From Swiss-Prot, chain A:
InterPro entries: Phage_lambda_portal (IPR006429). NCBIfam families: portal_lambda (TIGR01539). It is found in: Virion. The keyword Cytoplasm does not apply. It comes from Escherichia phage lambda. The keyword DNA-binding applies. Keywords: Capsid protein, DNA-binding, Viral capsid assembly, Viral genome ejection through host cell envelope, Viral genome packaging, Viral long flexible tail ejection system, Viral penetration into host cytoplasm, Viral release from host cell, Virion, Virus entry into host cell. GO terms for biological process: symbiont genome ejection through host cell envelope, long flexible tail mechanism; virion assembly. Its main location: virion. This is Portal protein B. The gene is B. Forms the portal vertex of the capsid. This portal plays critical roles in head assembly, genome packaging, neck/tail attachment, and genome ejection. The portal protein multimerizes as a single ring-shaped homododecamer arranged around a central channel. Binds to the terminase subunits to form the packaging machine. It comes from the Viruses. GO terms for cellular component: viral portal complex.
Swiss-Prot record, chains C, F:
Homomultimer. Interacts with FI protein. It comes from the Viruses. Belongs to the lambda phage major capsid protein family. The chain holds residues 294 to 341 of 341 of the full protein. It is found in: Virion; Host cytoplasm. Assembles to form an icosahedral capsid with a T=7 symmetry. The icosahedral capsid is about 60 nm in diameter and composed of 415 major capsid proteins. The assembly is primed by the interaction between capsid assembly protease and portal dodecamer, and major capsid proteins assemble cooperatively to form the procapsid with the help of capsid scaffolding protein. Major capsid protein forms hexons and pentons of the icosahedron. Viral genomic DNA is packaged into the procapsid through the portal vertex. This is Major capsid protein.
From Swiss-Prot, chain D:
Assembles to form an icosahedral capsid with a T=7 symmetry. The icosahedral capsid is about 60 nm in diameter and composed of 415 major capsid proteins. The assembly is primed by the interaction between capsid assembly protease and portal dodecamer, and major capsid proteins assemble cooperatively to form the procapsid with the help of capsid scaffolding protein. Major capsid protein forms hexons and pentons of the icosahedron. Viral genomic DNA is packaged into the procapsid through the portal vertex. Homomultimer. Interacts with FI protein. This is Major capsid protein. It comes from Escherichia phage lambda (Bacteriophage lambda). It is found in: Virion; Host cytoplasm. Belongs to the lambda phage major capsid protein family. The gene is E. The chain holds residues 99 to 147 of 341 of the full protein. Coiled coil: none annotated.
Curated annotation (Swiss-Prot), chain G:
Forms the portal vertex of the capsid. This portal plays critical roles in head assembly, genome packaging, neck/tail attachment, and genome ejection. The portal protein multimerizes as a single ring-shaped homododecamer arranged around a central channel. Binds to the terminase subunits to form the packaging machine. It comes from Escherichia phage lambda (Bacteriophage lambda). Belongs to the siphoviridae portal protein family. Homododecamer. Interacts with the terminase complex composed of two small and one large terminase subunits. It is found in: Virion. Proteolytically cleaved by the viral protease during capsid maturation. This is Portal protein B.
């Protein structure tokens, strides 16, 4: 009964329409992204939020672990591991290429690709990456990735939206998109605006284009940025801080008031020192106390002004907490505020933030990375740089998901103090509940090369003849 | 009990319209879309009689009365023939069509 | 013609009019030339 | 009893206008077609043209 | 009694609630309620926070299946049962989490994404609808497909009333069990006549064509209520209050000072504030320099307003209102409002415990059921396609032993730790005392005991081959 | 009005009057106003 | 006249007539402390300790 009319009317007028999220979003789709870009470019809080998002979802490094389903494919485990290590070696020598050749723009690496994609998905709702086959023979690989901002993809010539051609997205009857109408660069704003249509999928089974976002309900075609519930309060708070700073400025500026029937020049000379004997009225030499002798009929009223911060700190606390709730990030890391909080409280905050970040990582960055990894893998296979197992029951096209099964590791949870978590991990290993690859992943490493490096280290220590390390016999 | 929802479209062409403010000397309650000429004697703004040829100088934008010292009127654009009121003294349809020749005001 | 869509079955355009009267105009552009090469194949008879 | 904002009213107007224009152009295409295969002498004429 | 009669000295004499069913208490304004909840969650930061917490704790990040068929009931050998369970688990692993997004007809989500979306829309609408489509395109190995349906899509055809079997687009039997649905085609843009299609709840062959899950509160309920429906107006009024108070702070800070000068505005501004000095209305922009004490004559006074403390109890009032809102939403106020001050470890533990208990209850009562239905449909397709080997000596066939074959549960993201050392000691003590098992331990850790054992043995073999060190499980 | 169900087809009600001649009365209220969208869709002719 | 408890219902009181809201007085003007003292006295007289008595 609450949703009917409310107590004493109140919401006698609040009857928002009931329609699909696409119907409620697409007409103002451009405006929302425009305002989001404005905030992210000219707002400190937004820049902090996006930087924290990228640095926690991905961080400095983002590595691969290729775990094909050998059991399903009927392949020997040793052959599966050999293929996995060979493809990992090729992938690692390809991804960290200094020329940024993975990008046609040739200015960003793979981790930069992932971070930029997740950031633009954050402040736009979605990410677009296309794969291209160049004719350049300088490299063993001809597939490169190119980013597309959501602005570049829209209805060609701003044509009216239809049942299937929505915002430049051509969708079949069922509800799965198949074509995009991207637009070329908008700068400078005098060349003719051109459009190019691209199918999401090449006829041969290779993902020519990928568009990643998480929907909220059926029929959704475009993502919604995280600012859609916060942006108005964000800009209002910016205006508040601006006007409060102006008010503090003027209140501090105006301090004293002179009252006298005398001509202003002589009044300044006889009261505020002045130097008229030698525009901007007259400069005042800042010197000693200079007690004046104002005549009856004069006033030297010193304005006590007013306190600069009358509750603005508490207001920023409350509004930043609301913004943190809207953004899904903890207020502490959001506002660089960590006062009056205990160790347990800080750990709880970091825990929930890390859980949200791990979910977001898996559902955005992991999916994008897997898609681009299989896109590179198909080219590698067709290029024959790696040889498929002979006992392969199913073809690569059939077992594309099975062949390309892999997971990803980003920056680990650098916890509050280190010692307690590392000793609890060690005792987990002692008790046999966790496992080496699990904990080394949670730390950001891979047990395979960890073991290889430890073998190398102990071989070096044996050669130098100093001491066997903590791994021998 | 049967009402109709007319598509109120006073305009008649894609050409832009423009408005100018001039002193008001109208002698009667004149509704909007009223053609009006400049007074021969006092150079005042009076409603177009429909008898003088081409004397009409503009189209009334907002309805006013005698007490209105100034008024806003269209200076440019095209308007449909039917939806602009005409003075009764104007009879010939061709004259009505060609009344605003030589100006930025046209009718269709 | 700006973006090379000269030979098109349809061309829709929509622009807003500046100035004091605010408005935008909808327009679709086309130029049909429906033809038939061999008219003799068809025989038309007006009955009575 | 359940109204909508002027923005959505304008959206409705623009949609019906687009469909009407498409219907009109299809209509004139069919008129040309029936002239063509009805006489073989088809006069494309009109005011301001 | 006496309390419920009229009221203390009358009071609630006019409070006469219309005792009747929740069905007629919700259906008359159900569409408006759903629209209000959707708008509120779309435009409110706190509501988005609440649904995100739902999406990240009720389901969490992952989901691992554990198929425990009732081999006792089926009279089948345990080894055969577990071999079949391993086979079906491998098939499900290679099917559900493929990178294609082939299962969804929209081809943009995964299995975990579908579960998260379903639980979210069930939270903010009260119901969840999924459809199983056996598309004829046999290029993919599994020809089934899924597509969740929002409660807005399902509605009474032609927007009519409600009959004794057809209610809000749901056609039920005499006993109220749902028989079918009337799905309305998406009508974007909102002009076309949204056609209505009849979809049976189940296929004649026993296949669950349409799976609908909600939480009825009394007999005969067919459409659940969104959890927001408790405090929607309260949180809306909170939003209005915070916006109004922000505007109030804006205006309070806007006009810092006023001047009492009687002469012309321009001259007064020049002689009391300065500015001027233009090149060769917008009033007069004032350069910001230093001090610039003015001079005044009688009748002139520069009075700078002291304004007013912006936060006179607003923050604490908001804290109390968020207490109420979090109580309504069933989520901990601390977590929702992100204010963790003055909180001791023990009380934080207690609040987290109750919140997580609620979260796991919701998980088991929504996500577990939905995933079980989807897995049952997929298993039906798998068995009819003989992609897996049913036990040879099965007492009952799949069609009548669906539950017996479909005995399975799911493990999502576990209860993330709060201290680390404390719960690892918990686990160590439980395993060394025998009061718990590796299955429960790895489940609460978000792991699988079989996978853990396989990983441990393979790592032991690798370390033995490398001659590095035996792990803490040998011989 | 007090039951809040004022929108449906046929409303039944049986009630007893008080006093010695206590008698029951049965009632089926309705406000039926059926209609057709297009009158000109259906064509009527008076045969002769 | 019974008065419905609704929203703000701000009035438009004419000149001459006024509405005043009594600020009242604290319900406990040291009453709790006076109770502390007197119950202490009573507990001492009874021999039972104050904390359990009160």
């Amino acid at each position: 009964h609450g949703g009917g009319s409310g107590f004493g009317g109140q919401l006698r007028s609040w009857n928002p329409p009931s329609e699909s999220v696409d119907a409620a979003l697409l007409p103002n789709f451009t405006r929302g992204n425009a305002r989001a870009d404005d905030l992210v470019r000219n707002n400190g809080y937004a820049a902090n939020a996006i930087q924290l998002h990228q640095d926690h979802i991905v961080g400095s490094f983002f590595r691969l672990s290729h775990r094909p389903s050998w059991r399903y494919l009927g392949i020997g485990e040793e052959e599966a591991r050999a293929f996995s290590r060979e493809v990992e070696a090729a992938w690692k020598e390809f991804a960290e290429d200094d020329c940024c050749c993975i990008d046609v723009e040739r200015k960003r690496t793979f981790t930069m690709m992932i971070r930029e994609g997740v950031a633009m998905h954050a402040f736009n709702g979605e990410l677009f990456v296309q794969a291209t086959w160049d004719t350049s023979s300088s490299r063993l690989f001809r597939t490169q990735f190119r980013m597309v901002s959501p602005k570049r993809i829209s209805n060609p010539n701003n044509t009216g939206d239809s049942r299937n051609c929505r915002a430049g997205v051509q969708i079949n009857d069922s509800g799965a998109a198949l074509g995009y109408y991207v637009s070329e660069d908008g700068y400078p704003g005098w060349m003719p605006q051109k459009w190019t249509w691209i199918p999401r999928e090449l006829p041969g089974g290779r993902a020519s284009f990928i568009h990643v976002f998480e929907p909220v309900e059926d029929g959704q075609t475009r993502g919604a940025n995280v600012f859609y519930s916060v942006m108005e309060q964000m800009k209002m708070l910016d205006t508040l801080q601006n006007t409060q700073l102006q008010s503090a400025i003027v209140k501090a500026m105006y301090a004293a008031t002179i009252e006298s029937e005398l001509d202003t020049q002589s009044a300044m000379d006889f009261i505020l020192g002045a130097n008229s004997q030698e525009y901007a009225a007259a400069p005042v030499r800042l010197g000693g106390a200079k007690v004046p002798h104002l005549m009856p009929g004069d006033s030297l009223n010193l304005q006590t002004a007013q306190d600069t911060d009358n509750g603005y700190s508490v207001f920023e606390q409350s509004l930043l907490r609301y913004i943190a709730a809207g953004l899904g990030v903890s207020y502490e890391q959001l506002s660089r505020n960590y006062a009056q909080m205990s160790y347990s409280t800080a750990r709880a905050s970091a825990n929930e933030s890390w859980a949200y970040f791990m979910g977001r990582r898996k559902f955005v960055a992991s999916r994008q990375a897997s898609q681009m990894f299989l896109c590179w893998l198909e080219e590698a296979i067709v290029r024959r740089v790696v040889t498929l197992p002979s006992k392969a029951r199913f073809s690569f096209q059939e077992a594309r998901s099975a062949w390309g099964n892999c997971d990803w590791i980003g920056s680990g949870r650098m916890a509050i103090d280190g010692l307690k978590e590392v000793q609890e991990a060690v005792m987990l290993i002692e008790a046999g509940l966790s496992t080496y690859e699990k904990e080394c992943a949670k730390r950001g490493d891979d047990y395979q090369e960890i073991f290889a490096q430890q073998v190398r280290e102990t071989m070096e220590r044996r050669a130098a003849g100093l001491k066997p390390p903590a791994w021998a016999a | 009990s049967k009402e109709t929802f007319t598509h109120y479209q006073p305009q008649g062409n894609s050409d832009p319209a423009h408005t100018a403010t001039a002193p008001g000397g109208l002698s009667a309650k004149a509704p909007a879309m009223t053609p009006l000429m400049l007074d021969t004697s006092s150079r005042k703004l009076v409603a177009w009689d429909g008898t003088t040829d081409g004397a009409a100088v503009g189209i009334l934008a907002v309805a006013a009365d005698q007490t209105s010292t100034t008024l806003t009127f269209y200076k440019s654009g095209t308007f449909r023939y039917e939806d602009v009121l005409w003075p009764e003294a104007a009879s010939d349809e061709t004259k009505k069509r060609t009344a605003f020749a030589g100006t930025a005001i046209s009718i269709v | 013609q700006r973006e090379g869509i000269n030979a098109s079955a349809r061309y829709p355009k929509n622009w807003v009019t500046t100035g004091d009267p605010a408005r935008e105009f909808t327009m679709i552009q086309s130029a049909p030339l429906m033809l038939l090469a061999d008219p003799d194949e068809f025989v038309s008879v007006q009955l009575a | 009893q359940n109204l909508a904002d002027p923005a959505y009213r304008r959206r409705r107007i623009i949609m019906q206008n687009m469909r009407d224009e498409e219907l009109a152009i299809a209509q004139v295409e069919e008129m040309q077609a029936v002239s063509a295969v009805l006489k073989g002498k088809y006069t494309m004429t009109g005011e301001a043209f």
